[PDB]
């Protein structure tokens, strides 16, 4: 590969089905996507669906749903200067009864560019907060 | 190994290399200078095996005790250090990729029942130079 990937995992005290609600309902991404301005999806929340997303003070971006698995995970793919960025969201079950939420950002490929890595870091910088917000919302 | 209160940062990098070669930079404590950028001193009370204790000192920081909690050649090794936020666990994983290439994944985690900013910021700090550390291992292994 030319792969590089950042992950953040946070354990939360709730049910995977309840977590799934905030993922599979694009209109509720505002509660956890920091800076989300507008969001839309060209159909059902399923593997292969295309949508449009826009963060504050940024051009709106097309994305495609890569691997929707109900109650478990969904991924989205967006084109960037550095090629396709894959964003992953996983609900993991822990033995102690909690679930964990793991969000990951990766650059499909690139020969370890100094600016590639710096690019991922910036995208990934907001991720821990967003996962934090989910946890506090889910533990209500 | 995660559960209530835990948080964990991971960085993974694909490297065109073999697992045995990567493992030599993990299992030999004296090699950590190649990939630990602020490393000043490093020792281990014996052989690179699960349970072994050791010490290490980083630029501008006091010496620190640490334990090897899990070792598997040539897959992974993990160490535990005590901090003001409980124990921090550092993980180092070698993963064989389906295109022959391997991946190195370094992670750091701790347990904070409160999930405070203090604990978060503290973990984030430790994880901050982990991507470059892994990048050095990449550069070294690919020659």
Residue numbers in the entry:
A (entry chain A): -2 to 137
B (entry chain B): -5 to 137
Copied sentences from the primary study:
One such case is SMU.440 (GeneID: 1029579), which is composed of 138 residues. SMU.440 is a hypothetical protein without any known functions or protein family classification. The crystal structure reveals a fold similar to known polyketide cyclases even though the amino acid sequences are quite different. SMU.440 also shares a similar binding pocket composed primarily of residues with aromatic and acidic side-chains, which points to a potential binding of a polyketide-like molecule.
The crystal structure of SMU.440 has been determined at 2.4 Å resolution using the SIRAS (single isomorphous replacement with anomalous scattering) method and all residues except the last one could be fitted into the electron density. In addition, five residues from the N-terminal His6-tag were also observed in the structure. SMU.440 is comprised of three α-helices and a seven-stranded antiparallel β-sheet, bending into an unclosed β-barrel. The structure belongs to the SCOP superfamily of Bet v1-like proteins. There are two molecules per asymmetric unit (ASU) and they form a homodimer via a pair of antiparallel β-strands. Prediction of assemblies by the PISA server indicates that this dimer interface is the largest (interface area 946.6 Å2) with a favorable interaction energy (ΔiG −6.9 kcal/mol), in agreement with the dimer state in solution observed during the gel filtration chromatography experiment. A large forked cavity is formed as the β-barrel wraps around the long C-terminal α3-helix. The volume of the cavity is about 1 050 Å3 with a surface area of ∼700 Å2. The cavity is comprised of Trp26, Trp29, Glu30, Asp32, Met50, Met52, Met55, Phe60, Phe71, Asp73, Thr75, Thr77, Val82, Phe84, His86, His100, Val102, Phe116, Ile120, Asp123, Val124 and Ser127, most of which are quite conserved residues among the SMU.440 homologs. In the bottom of the pocket are primarily aromatic residues; whereas at the top of the pocket, close to the cavity opening, the residues can be divided into two parts, one side with mainly acidic and the other with neutral residues.
